Design a protein around this motif. Structure first.
Motif, PDB file in Angstrom:
ATOM      1  N   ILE A 194      -8.817   4.875   0.102  1.00 36.75           N
ATOM      2  CA  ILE A 194      -8.950   5.592  -0.982  1.00 36.75           C
ATOM      3  C   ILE A 194      -7.677   5.830  -1.538  1.00 36.75           C
ATOM      4  O   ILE A 194      -6.367   6.198  -0.799  1.00 36.75           O
ATOM      5  CB  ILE A 194      -9.671   7.063  -1.104  1.00 36.75           C
ATOM      6  CG1 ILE A 194     -10.910   6.926  -0.290  1.00 36.75           C
ATOM      7  CG2 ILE A 194      -9.539   7.636  -2.229  1.00 36.75           C
ATOM      8  CD1 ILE A 194     -11.876   6.036  -1.189  1.00 36.75           C
ATOM      9  N   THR A 195      -7.269   5.534  -2.740  1.00 39.17           N
ATOM     10  CA  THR A 195      -6.113   5.809  -3.595  1.00 39.17           C
ATOM     11  C   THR A 195      -6.347   6.828  -4.775  1.00 39.17           C
ATOM     12  O   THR A 195      -7.505   6.907  -5.216  1.00 39.17           O
ATOM     13  CB  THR A 195      -5.457   4.572  -4.301  1.00 39.17           C
ATOM     14  OG1 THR A 195      -4.339   4.837  -4.691  1.00 39.17           O
ATOM     15  CG2 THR A 195      -6.363   4.064  -5.070  1.00 39.17           C
ATOM     16  N   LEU A 202      -8.416   6.952   5.063  1.00 36.78           N
ATOM     17  CA  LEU A 202      -9.271   5.866   4.999  1.00 36.78           C
ATOM     18  C   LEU A 202     -10.755   6.382   4.994  1.00 36.78           C
ATOM     19  O   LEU A 202     -11.036   7.581   5.596  1.00 36.78           O
ATOM     20  CB  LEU A 202      -9.022   5.617   6.424  1.00 36.78           C
ATOM     21  CG  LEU A 202     -10.112   4.294   7.228  1.00 36.78           C
ATOM     22  CD1 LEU A 202      -9.556   3.512   8.055  1.00 36.78           C
ATOM     23  CD2 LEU A 202     -11.308   5.055   7.745  1.00 36.78           C
ATOM     24  N   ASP A 203     -11.390   5.957   4.130  1.00 41.96           N
ATOM     25  CA  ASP A 203     -12.777   6.302   3.795  1.00 41.96           C
ATOM     26  C   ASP A 203     -14.014   5.927   4.738  1.00 41.96           C
ATOM     27  O   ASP A 203     -14.910   6.454   5.437  1.00 41.96           O
ATOM     28  CB  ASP A 203     -13.375   5.761   2.388  1.00 41.96           C
ATOM     29  CG  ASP A 203     -14.530   6.379   1.969  1.00 41.96           C
ATOM     30  OD1 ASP A 203     -14.631   7.352   1.562  1.00 41.96           O
ATOM     31  OD2 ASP A 203     -15.535   5.782   2.202  1.00 41.96           O
ATOM     32  N   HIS A 204     -13.592   4.545   5.263  1.00 41.52           N
ATOM     33  CA  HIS A 204     -14.611   3.897   6.326  1.00 41.52           C
ATOM     34  C   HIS A 204     -13.925   2.541   6.711  1.00 41.52           C
ATOM     35  O   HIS A 204     -12.919   2.326   6.254  1.00 41.52           O
ATOM     36  CB  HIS A 204     -16.011   3.589   5.662  1.00 41.52           C
ATOM     37  CG  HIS A 204     -16.111   2.702   4.380  1.00 41.52           C
ATOM     38  ND1 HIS A 204     -16.068   3.157   3.299  1.00 41.52           N
ATOM     39  CD2 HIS A 204     -16.140   1.494   4.433  1.00 41.52           C
ATOM     40  CE1 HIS A 204     -16.130   2.090   2.271  1.00 41.52           C
ATOM     41  NE2 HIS A 204     -16.193   0.802   3.126  1.00 41.52           N
ATOM     42  N   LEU A 205     -14.812   2.217   7.698  1.00 43.56           N
ATOM     43  CA  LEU A 205     -14.227   0.913   8.080  1.00 43.56           C
ATOM     44  C   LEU A 205     -15.616   0.077   8.665  1.00 43.56           C
ATOM     45  O   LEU A 205     -16.592   0.728   8.770  1.00 43.56           O
ATOM     46  CB  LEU A 205     -13.304   0.874   9.462  1.00 43.56           C
ATOM     47  CG  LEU A 205     -13.565   1.925  10.664  1.00 43.56           C
ATOM     48  CD1 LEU A 205     -14.546   1.076  11.716  1.00 43.56           C
ATOM     49  CD2 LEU A 205     -12.306   2.344  11.353  1.00 43.56           C
ATOM     50  N   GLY A 239      -1.420   9.785   4.074  1.00 44.18           N
ATOM     51  CA  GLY A 239      -2.038  10.925   4.204  1.00 44.18           C
ATOM     52  C   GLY A 239      -1.774  11.587   5.603  1.00 44.18           C
ATOM     53  O   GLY A 239      -0.485  11.713   5.853  1.00 44.18           O
ATOM     54  N   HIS A 240      -2.737  12.115   6.105  1.00 45.27           N
ATOM     55  CA  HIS A 240      -2.598  12.915   7.694  1.00 45.27           C
ATOM     56  C   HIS A 240      -3.150  11.936   8.557  1.00 45.27           C
ATOM     57  O   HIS A 240      -3.208  12.412   9.816  1.00 45.27           O
ATOM     58  CB  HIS A 240      -3.184  14.195   7.597  1.00 45.27           C
ATOM     59  CG  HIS A 240      -2.482  15.199   6.651  1.00 45.27           C
ATOM     60  ND1 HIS A 240      -3.485  16.078   5.659  1.00 45.27           N
ATOM     61  CD2 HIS A 240      -1.243  15.599   6.505  1.00 45.27           C
ATOM     62  CE1 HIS A 240      -2.484  16.709   5.034  1.00 45.27           C
ATOM     63  NE2 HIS A 240      -1.228  16.540   5.486  1.00 45.27           N
ATOM     64  N   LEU A 287       0.690  -1.102   0.002  1.00 48.04           N
ATOM     65  CA  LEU A 287       0.026   0.127  -0.080  1.00 48.04           C
ATOM     66  C   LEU A 287       0.806   1.321  -0.040  1.00 48.04           C
ATOM     67  O   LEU A 287       0.301   2.331   0.190  1.00 48.04           O
ATOM     68  CB  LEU A 287      -0.794   0.004   1.283  1.00 48.04           C
ATOM     69  CG  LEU A 287      -2.057  -0.951   0.780  1.00 48.04           C
ATOM     70  CD1 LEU A 287      -2.845  -0.878   2.250  1.00 48.04           C
ATOM     71  CD2 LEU A 287      -2.718  -0.806  -0.473  1.00 48.04           C
ATOM     72  N   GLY A 288       2.138   1.213   0.076  1.00 53.36           N
ATOM     73  CA  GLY A 288       2.894   2.284  -0.033  1.00 53.36           C
ATOM     74  C   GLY A 288       2.990   3.128   1.324  1.00 53.36           C
ATOM     75  O   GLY A 288       3.394   4.346   1.166  1.00 53.36           O
ATOM     76  N   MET A 289       2.635   2.601   2.190  1.00 48.79           N
ATOM     77  CA  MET A 289       2.646   3.141   3.371  1.00 48.79           C
ATOM     78  C   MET A 289       3.968   3.517   4.129  1.00 48.79           C
ATOM     79  O   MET A 289       4.849   2.716   3.696  1.00 48.79           O
ATOM     80  CB  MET A 289       1.715   2.760   4.569  1.00 48.79           C
ATOM     81  CG  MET A 289       0.099   2.682   4.311  1.00 48.79           C
ATOM     82  SD  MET A 289      -0.892   2.143   5.492  1.00 48.79           S
ATOM     83  CE  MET A 289      -2.583   2.235   4.566  1.00 48.79           C
TER      84      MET A 289
END
Lengths: 131, 129
Positions: A78-79, B8-11, A48-49, A31-33
């Protein structure tokens, strides 16, 4: 000054995992984290943040979930990468895509998703808002 | 290609009872319960959401090891933290600890903690100083 209770966003969440190194290698490669460490050997993954804090099973930090469980998370990221490229990339890391691309509902409207599992069996949904 | 995730959109939380969970998050955290998909329920906050599953109901795919009370979440509020804590207390919720200094994604935060109906750990926090 009456007020309404409101939450702005999720800052982070905690995953409990069998092996932190296995997990960090996976999330970085797939995931490139950005795996980081802080304080007294605390480990996290940044994107992201936001971030995900990692606890190793048997070395958990308090307070924590009532019923700690490896593989119990179900997360949608989301990507901004073209989803077909994202899928190709993930498969190219040797990861089995279990479904996708499929239309789903995101927080802000329609998304397109694909799915795979992390090393503890957590369900990972990678998605785009691109129509 | 350098793979990358923006946010993160959701979980998904798996809970013993969706109506109980829905009432809790609406009252305690001001979230909005909405219907979506095929008979599904989510809790909206900001531009994210929490999708709910009821333990025992058929859905695929899900976490390998579904477990109620297995989540550990940190939310940011823009409301003054002391006011937020007083509000949560007035809902009858037991505050485990707070306000205490903790670490957020973007630096130091101030937090308080409580559990939801399934035992998930909820941390409500601010970056405000």
């Amino acid at each position: 000054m009456e007020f309404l209770m409101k939450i702005s966003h999720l800052d982070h969440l905690v995953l409990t995992v069998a092996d932190i190194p296995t997990t960090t290698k996976f999330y970085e490669k797939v995931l490139g984290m950005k795996a980081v460490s802080f304080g007294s050997g605390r480990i996290a993954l940044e994107f992201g943040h936001q971030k995900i804090n990692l606890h190793q099973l048997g070395h958990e930090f308090e307070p924590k979930a009532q019923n700690v469980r490896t593989g119990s998370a179900d997360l949608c990221f989301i990507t901004d990468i073209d989803l077909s490229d994202a899928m190709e990339y993930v498969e190219n890391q040797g990861v089995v895509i279990m479904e996708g691309p499929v239309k789903r509902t995101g927080a802000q409207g329609a998304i397109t998703s694909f799915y795979f599992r992390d090393p503890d069996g957590n369900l990972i949904e990678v998605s785009t808002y691109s129509n």
